[PDB]
Amino acid sequence: YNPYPEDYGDIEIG
Amino acid sequence: DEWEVSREKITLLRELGQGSFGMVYEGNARDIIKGEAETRVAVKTVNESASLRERIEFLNEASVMKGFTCHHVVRLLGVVSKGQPTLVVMELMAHGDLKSYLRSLRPEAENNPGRPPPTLQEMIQMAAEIADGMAYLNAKKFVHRDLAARNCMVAHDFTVKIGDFGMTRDIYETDYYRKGGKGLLPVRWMAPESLKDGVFTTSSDMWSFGVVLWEITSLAEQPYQGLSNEQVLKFVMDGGYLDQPDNCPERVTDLMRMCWQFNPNMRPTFLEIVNLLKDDLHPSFPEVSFFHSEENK
Numbered sequence: 046y047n048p049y050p051e052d053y054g055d056i057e058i059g
Numbered sequence: 060d061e062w063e064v065s066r067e068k069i070t071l072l073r074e075l076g077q078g079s080f081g082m083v084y085e086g087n088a089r090d091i092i093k094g095e096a097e098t099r100v101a102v103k104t105v106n107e108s109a110s111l112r113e114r115i116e117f118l119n120e121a122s123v124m125k126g127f128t129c130h131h132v133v134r135l136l137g138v139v140s141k142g143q144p145t146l147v148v149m150e151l152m153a154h155g156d157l158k159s160y161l162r163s164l165r166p167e168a169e170n171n172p173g174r175p176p177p178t179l180q181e182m183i184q185m186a187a188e189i190a191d192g193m194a195y196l197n198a199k200k201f202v203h204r205d206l207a208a209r210n211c212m213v214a215h216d217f218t219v220k221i222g223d224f225g226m227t228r229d230i231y232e233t234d235y236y237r238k239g240g241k242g243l244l245p246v247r248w249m250a251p252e253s254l255k256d257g258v259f260t261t262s263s264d265m266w267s268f269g270v271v272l273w274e275i276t277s278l279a280e281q282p283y284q285g286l287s288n289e290q291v292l293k294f295v296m297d298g299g300y301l302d303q304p305d306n307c308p309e310r311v312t313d314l315m316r317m318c319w320q321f322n323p324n325m326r327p328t329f330l331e332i333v334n335l336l337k338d339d340l341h342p343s344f345p346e347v348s349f350f351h352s353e354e355n356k
Contacts, residue, residue, distance in 0.1 A: 055242070
């Protein structure tokens with residue numbers, strides 16, 4: 046049940 | 060609660076790994092599944108220092124899962140909500156998350172379990188299972204928003220199931236969920252219109268499904284390697300998409316391309332994916348699938 050924190054990034058959408 | 064489990068029935072054995080909101084454990088649960096005196100389970104918990112938002116989201120995710128019954132969706136087994144901490148008890152997936160699983164099957168992987176990489180047949184089976192779980196979620200009027208190999212789980216018998224509903228949202232009233240603004244987001248899995256307009260629909264889950272196929276065929280390489288998060292955001296909004304992995308089977312390439320149509324209205328549905336694949340699957344599939352069930356109406 047590995048976290049992959051690098052698979053998320055702080056970005057703006059919309 | 061029909062979901063409540065007595066705390067004394069749970070024993071924690073070891074840490075499985077960090078979940079969205081806190082540590083997940085492998086545990087034993089007594090008398091949680093009819094016919095089993097004791098069952099090995101996954102137990103999700105909230106971090107001691109979780110923000111208020113994270114504490115709320117952890118509880119919301121457990122709540123969402125109470126409504127689901129699908130062979131291709133990881134099962135909620137119970138909640139310990141008396142006293143503290145809250146324990147969320149789920150079906151243990153013996154082979155972990157699919158991203159970790161795929162990475163272990165690389166020829167050079169230190170943890171290569173001594174088994175060959177997925178065959179075309181096995182990749183098609185995985186695809187149909189993931190799409191069936193997603194078809195179910197869509198029929199239940201939820202959008203997943205974080206479909207990715209890391210959020211699919213692999214059972215003892217190698218059946219793949221959708222897990223991790225940390226970003227999942229109800230779409231019953233409108234068929235979409237909109238959330239513009241800054242966020243910690245799975246940018247490499249997100250559809251151009253999600254990036255542009257903040258909109259999430261079953262069609263944007265379909266885009267992510269395409270990336271899952273790309274992960275399966277690349278043994279979970281990182282999508283858009285060499286691009287930063289901000290470069291991916293630009294690239295994809297401007298019509299960019301991933302290249303085909305080395306030796307990617309053509310059947311799978313064709314599907315990926317369809318999932319990555321710029322216009323969401325042109326992408327397939329999850330029901331269409333299962334239907335495309337329905338004649339190339341294990342004999343048990345119609346016995347367990349949402350697709351072949353009376354519920355699929």
